[PDB]
Each structure stands twice: as C-alpha cells, then as structure tokens.
C-alpha cells in the first residue's frame, strides 16, 4: 500500500502532515518513521510525534519489546 497508513493523524498532537512533512530521523527520506503501539487492538503512530529520540526508536526496532504510545503508556495493562 506504499503510503496508505503513513499519513494518518496518529494522536491529538500529531505534527505529521502529507503537505508539510520533511525527514527528521537519519533513517527517513520520503516517509515518516512509525512505531506500533500494542495498546488494545494496537495502532500505528509516528515516532516523531512521540518525541522518541532516534537511538530509542532504533533500539525498539531492533528488539522484541512492545511499545506503548504516550496516550496509552500509563494504562493498567
């Protein structure tokens, strides 16, 4: 689906916009980096919108640890 899924409004403060986006992380070129939040049935969020530093994002991508976005991170599991 190449871009479908990338241009969503991932959270109430989402800054990623198909009409304004530019690369931020060293791994980005033409699309925003994203990470899967395991809360409930799960959902995708833009890593930048979560204020995730690059190394944190990369480490998460290189492991099996589940990630929980800022909106759901405090919810009793």
């Amino acid at each position: 689906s190449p871009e479908f899924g990338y241009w969503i409004t991932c959270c109430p403060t989402c800054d990623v916009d198909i009409n304004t986006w530019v690369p931020f992380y060293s791994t980005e070129l033409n699309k925003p980096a994203m990470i899967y939040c395991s809360h409930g049935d799960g959902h995708w969020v833009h890593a930048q919108c979560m204020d995730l530093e690059e190394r944190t994002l990369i480490h998460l991508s290189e492991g099996s640890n589940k990630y929980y976005c800022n909106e759901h991170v405090q919810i009793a599991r």
């Binding site: 980096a33 990470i35 899967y36 890593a47």
Partner: peptide
C-alpha cells in the same frame, strides 16, 4: 517493536 522506515540507508 514493529516499526517502519527504521532501516539504515
């Protein structure tokens, strides 16, 4: 965690 656009270039 599953991610997108995190592969080194």
């Amino acid at each position: 965690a599953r991610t997108k656009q995190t592969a080194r270039k």
